Amino acid sequence: GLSEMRLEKDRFSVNLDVKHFSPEELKVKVLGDVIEVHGKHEERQDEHGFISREFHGKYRIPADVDPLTITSSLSSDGVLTVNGPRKQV
Amino acid sequence: GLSEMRLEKDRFSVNLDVKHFSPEELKVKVLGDVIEVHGKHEERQDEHGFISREFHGKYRIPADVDPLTITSSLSSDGVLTVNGPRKQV
């Protein structure tokens, strides 16, 4: 559903549901040992009105993770896959 | 996907994707002629770490809508259906 996180023994990959969001609006903030994720839907006022959608979350990487190894790639299905293997994995 | 809004000619029904969220964490704030929606996933720190998910949005009702008529009901599938017929509809 929405709580889609791959918790392995030596790595991880979060699959955030951000369909109809743009890579430009998606942020992955790897700081120290925590990741702040963002994703806001371009505000488009109309019949439906102002859009202030923010489908994001937060993932705190284990202390034994090398930040460098952390990557992300939004798929066309709108799934933001954030894979961050642990140090020397 | 995530941008799921039913825009009719005399009414509307927004179907917000908030699976794995609780009605207690969901808010619908009908004020004047705008609706501020909220929905935060209970923070549960673990392997995955602190959870700060906020899958919400914003819908500005037409001026010809009676706020009283506006209702909402989270389904078991995790779809928050917010139906708000216009005045005298």
Q: Residue for token digits 């102002």?
A: A50
Tokens of A56: 């994001």
Please choose, from the candidates A25, A89, A88, A85, the residue with its C-alpha nearest in 3D space to the C-alpha of residue A61: A85
Asked if A88 has any chain B CB less than 8 Å from its own CB, the reply is no
Q: A29, A38 in Cβ contact below 8 A?
A: yes
Annotation-wise, does B41 bind a ligand?
yes
**Alpha helices, DSSP H only, in chain A?**
none
Pairing outcome for strands B26-31 and B12-17: unpaired
Q: Taking the CA atoms of chain B, what radius of gyration do you get in angstroms?
A: 14
Tokens of B18: 């908030």
Tokens of A5: 């996180």
* CA B64 and chain centroid, separation: 20
Asked if A82 has any chain B CB less than 8 Å from its own CB, the reply is no
Q: Do B78 and A48 touch (CB under 8 A)?
A: no
User: What gap in Å lies between CA B44 and CA B24, rounded to an integer?
Assistant: 16
User: What gap in Å lies between CA A87 and CA B83, rounded to an integer?
Assistant: 49
User: What gap in Å lies between CA B70 and CA A39, rounded to an integer?
Assistant: 28
CB atoms within 10 A of CB A49: 20
Evaluate the CA torsion angle A38, A42, A48, A50 in order and state its sign.
Answer: positive
User: What gap in Å lies between CA A82 and CA A32, rounded to an integer?
Assistant: 16
Q: A18, A26 in Cβ contact below 8 A?
A: yes
Cβ neighbours of B18 in A, within 8 Å: 2
User: What gap in Å lies between CA A20 and CA A65, rounded to an integer?
Assistant: 30
| DSSP secondary structure code for residue A86 in this structure | P
Question: B35 pairs with which residues across the strands?
Answer: B30, B59
Q: A33, A77 in Cβ contact below 8 A?
A: no
User: What gap in Å lies between CA B47 and CA A61, rounded to an integer?
Assistant: 8
CB atoms within 10 A of CB A57: 28
CB atoms within 10 A of CB A14: 23
Q: In this structure, which amino acid lies at residue A36?
A: E
- Name the experimental technique: NMR
SS3 content of chain A, % helix, strand, coil (to 5): 5, 40, 55
Asked if B21 has any chain A CB less than 8 Å from its own CB, the reply is yes
